[PDB]
Ligand binder design. Structure first.
Ligand code: CL
Ligand code: CL
Ligand code: CL
Ligand code: CL
Ligand code: CL
Ligand code: CL
Ligand code: CL
Ligand code: CL
Ligand code: CL
Ligand code: CL
Ligand code: CL
Ligand code: CL
Ligand code: CL
Ligand code: CL
Ligand code: CL
Ligand code: CL
Ligand code: CL
Ligand code: NA
Length: 129
């Protein structure tokens, strides 16, 4: 599924991500924009052999099982394929665990490099929310 910007904002809010761990909704929309361009089916292979999955590019080294990441964990207790669904529930629930792991949204390097310190509210501006 490729979400629209305001569509994704609304779905994230429906699932309780708005202001989760203190991160306003625009932070989450910005992260999704640069991780996946709002495409739930996004995947990307890392040099280490892990893979990132879904709208928030959640990595198989720690967070989900794909059967092909030696030595990895599955802390969200899900197949990585669940993170590619048109329904963002699994991605949101796993992101809540990730952002609670101590480093906040710095867990997403693209958030740190492209969203942190910017006008992230622009990502939700104009949306009926
Ligand atoms: Cl939209
Ligand atoms: Cl956009
Ligand atoms: Cl429901
Ligand atoms: Cl918010
Ligand atoms: Cl915001
Ligand atoms: Cl996703
Ligand atoms: Cl990670
Ligand atoms: Cl497992
Ligand atoms: Cl497996
Ligand atoms: Cl594995
Ligand atoms: Cl493979
Ligand atoms: Cl595990
Ligand atoms: Cl599994
Ligand atoms: Cl959804
Ligand atoms: Cl879930
Ligand atoms: Cl924080
Ligand atoms: Cl700031
Ligand atoms: Na894994």
């Amino acid at each position: 599924k490729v979400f629209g910007r305001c569509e994704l904002a609304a779905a994230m809010k429906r699932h309780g991500l708005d202001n989760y761990r203190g991160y306003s909704l625009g932070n989450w929309v910005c992260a999704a924009k640069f991780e996946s361009n709002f495409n739930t089916q996004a995947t990307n292979r890392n040099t280490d052999g892990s893979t990132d999955y879904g709208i928030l590019q959640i990595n198989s080294r720690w967070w989900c099982n794909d059967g092909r990441t030696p030595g990895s964990r599955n802390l969200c207790n899900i197949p990585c394929s669940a993170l590619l669904s048109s329904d963002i529930t699994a991605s949101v629930n796993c992101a809540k665990k990730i952002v609670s792991d101590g480093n906040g949204m710095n867990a997403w390097v693209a958030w740190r490099n492209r969203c942190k310190g910017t006008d992230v509210q622009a990502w939700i501006r104009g949306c009926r929310l």
